[PDB]
């Protein structure tokens, strides 16, 4: 099942993201269940916005908000929810919500799947427009959910991203 | 897998429907397999009609036609086949086909996912139009399958719905 | 899971294909993983082409290129990737890439799902156009992947198809 999926083939320059929400899709927020491994409708988003990239998580990891690391992956065409893409971290958007700080990484499809993302080695290689779009999306998607807020601090490099991967792995089962 | 999915987290005002067919979709009738838990093309529908809501079943239940309880869930945007939505029964369309009797329940998305369905407490709260549409759909979808017929008897309340849930759960035992 | 799916319920006039890529879809090449049974993005196709039919494999089989037998299934409407269709082999397109000659079978939806494919008993029953389209697709889809080539030899009958099914079933498990 989707639970039996490797965090990566070779952490952390080579990961597997499990996709929950496709780029440019209807505003349904899906999630994979811990016990079923099934795609659950987590929520119907209230703002009229869409994810600017495919949105998912790395299996066998844990952020300190009590969830796996979240990754945004851009692709030429939207991916099936519940499907897996081998990619390569290239940055992180650092933001804080309530309150367990909520960093989101950005990984691009691995060279084996496509060479279109080879010239993107680090966060600055991403277009400014897409970056502003991601930032703006996370600044606002929850605006119509009372008692929910997000402050976006900023972008950090691929090493920053890789760091969070290794960290959250190991915070990964242990306790 | 999709077999390992709870009937509900608190029957019966709080259930899980496994979605097989999305609202307003192509006329492919999918089903989840008992052994694989895989989404199987059960049939290509012959009439030019679409399901007016997402269509699915409650896991760990059995109707007396030899299938789990079927639930129709309305949502703002169609759901991925094979995905799960936490909802709340609000009624039942009572109908009879060839092989005994074929009640179909109507559950609305749980308040945790959206508050859009909070004012729908019972069957009458659903719009007339949607009700007539469901009824009409089930009256006719099988018209071009010889030796298949459906007579729609009528609508019953949420407690009627809840009843069928509890019943069919327990009848829940025997494959 | 999708791993636990029968090759067929009565080989070889009655098979199960696991669908990876839908007809007329975005050019994402998906695959089912051997360990997870999960839908993995195998590759982003580089040519501006689409699969003319749904594309998938028979579970519990092995071709001599080190993969299950691949089947193309036509349907009236595209199928969900990762879903299973009971169908009935009616032909085979014989082609060579290498490493590993690359026959692709063509099965049509079983009569239980639809009678639309009843009159297609063998390869010649398929329309010319669809045949030329499949052939032309496999001749060219890999044109922009250096060091990859395909020569299409030709079409063979349903018996030829069923043969490859029986062969590749055995060729598997047994070491």
DSSP secondary structure string for all residues of A75-127 = -SSPPPTT-EEEEEEEEEEEEE-SSS---EEEEEE-TTT-STTTT--SGGGS-
* Chain A residues touching chain C at CB-CB below 8 Å: 1-2, 4-5, 18, 75-80, 82-86, 109, 112-114, 116
Cα(A24)–Cα(A22) distance, integer angstroms: 6
Contact pairs from chain A to chain B, CB under 8 Å? 62
Range of the domain at C38: 1-175
Mutate to test the interface with B, among C3, C71, C79, C111 (most CBs of B within 10 A): C79
* Euclidean distance between CA atoms C79 and C63, whole angstroms: 24
Q: How many CB atoms lie within 10 A of CB C75?
A: 23
Q: Strand pairing of A28-32 and A39-44?
A: antiparallel
Q: What is the largest CA-CA distance in chain C?
A: 43
With beta carbons less than 8 A apart as the criterion, state whether C109 and C34 touch: no
Experimental approach: X-ray
Question: Which of chain C's residues have a Cβ under 8 Å away from the Cβ of A18?
Answer: 38
Q: How far apart are CA C138 and CA C70, in angstroms?
A: 13
Residue with tokens 């999960």: C38
| CB burial string A47-78: b at 16+ within 10 A, e below | eeebbbbbbbbbbbbbbeeeebbbbbbbbeeb
Q: Is B147 exposed, middle or buried (CB count within 10 Å of its CB: 0-12, 13-18, 19+)?
A: exposed
Cβ contacts of C22 on chain A, cutoff 8 Å: none
Task: Dig out the tokens for B17 from the structure.
Answer: 């429907």
Residue C70 counted as an annotated binding residue: yes
Chain B nearest CA to C109, separation (Å): 9
For residue C19, list its beta bridge partners.
C56
Structural domain count, chain C:
1
Coil, helix or strand at residue A169: helix
Which CATH number goes with the domain that contains C138?
A: 3.90.80.10
Q: Please give, rounded to a whole number of angstroms, the shortest distance from the CA of A38 to a CA of chain C.
A: 11
Distance (Å, whole) CA A1 – CA B38: 11
Distance, in angstroms, between B136 CA and closest chain A CA?
A: 27
List all chains that touch chain B, counting a touch as 3 or more CB pairs closer than 8 Å: A, C
Hey, which residues does A117 pair with through a beta bridge? Answer: none
Tell me the residues of C at the B interface, defined by beta carbons under 8 Å apart: 1-2, 4-6, 18, 75-80, 82-86, 109, 112-114, 116
Residue A93: what are its φ and ψ, rounded to 5°?
Answer: -90, 120
Judge: A85–C39 Cβ closer than 8 Å, yes or no. no
Map tokens 């979240």 to a residue: A70
Q: In chain A, what residues touch B84 (CB-CB under 8 Å)?
A: 33, 36, 38-41
CB-closest option in B4, B76, B112 to A35:
B4
- The secondary element (H helix, E strand) that includes residue C134 is helix C128-140
Show the tokens assigned to A58.
Answer: 């790395």
Torsion of CA C77, C80, C86, C87, to 10 degrees: 50
Contact A123, A158 (CB under 8 A): yes
Cα B25 from chain centroid?
15
Within 8 A by CB and 6+ apart from B102, the residues are B63, B65, B70, B95, B96, B150
Q: Provide φ and ψ at B13, rounded to 5°.
A: -85, 0
């Amino acid at each position: 099942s989707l639970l039996n999926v490797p965090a990566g083939k070779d952490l952390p320059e080579d990961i597997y993201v499990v996709i929950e929400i496709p780029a440019n899709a209807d505003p349904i927020k899906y999630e994979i269940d811990k016990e079923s491994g099934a795609l659950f409708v987590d929520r119907f988003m209230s703002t009229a916005m869409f994810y600017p990239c495919n949105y998912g998580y790395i299996n066998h990891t844990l952020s300190l908000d009590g969830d796996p690391v979240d990754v945004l992956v851009p692709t030429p065409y939207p991916l099936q929810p519940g499907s897996v893409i081998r990619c390569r971290p290239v940055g992180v958007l650092k933001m804080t919500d309530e309150a367990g700080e909520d960093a989101k990484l950005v990984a691009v499809p691995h060279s084996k799947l496509s060479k279109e993302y080879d010239h993107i080695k680090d966060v600055n290689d991403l277009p400014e427009l897409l970056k502003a779009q991601i930032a703006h999306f996370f600044e606002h998607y929850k605006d119509l959910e009372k008692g929910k807020w997000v402050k976006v601090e900023g972008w950090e490099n691929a090493e920053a991203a890789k760091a969070e991967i290794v960290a959250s792995f190991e915070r990964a089962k242990n306790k």
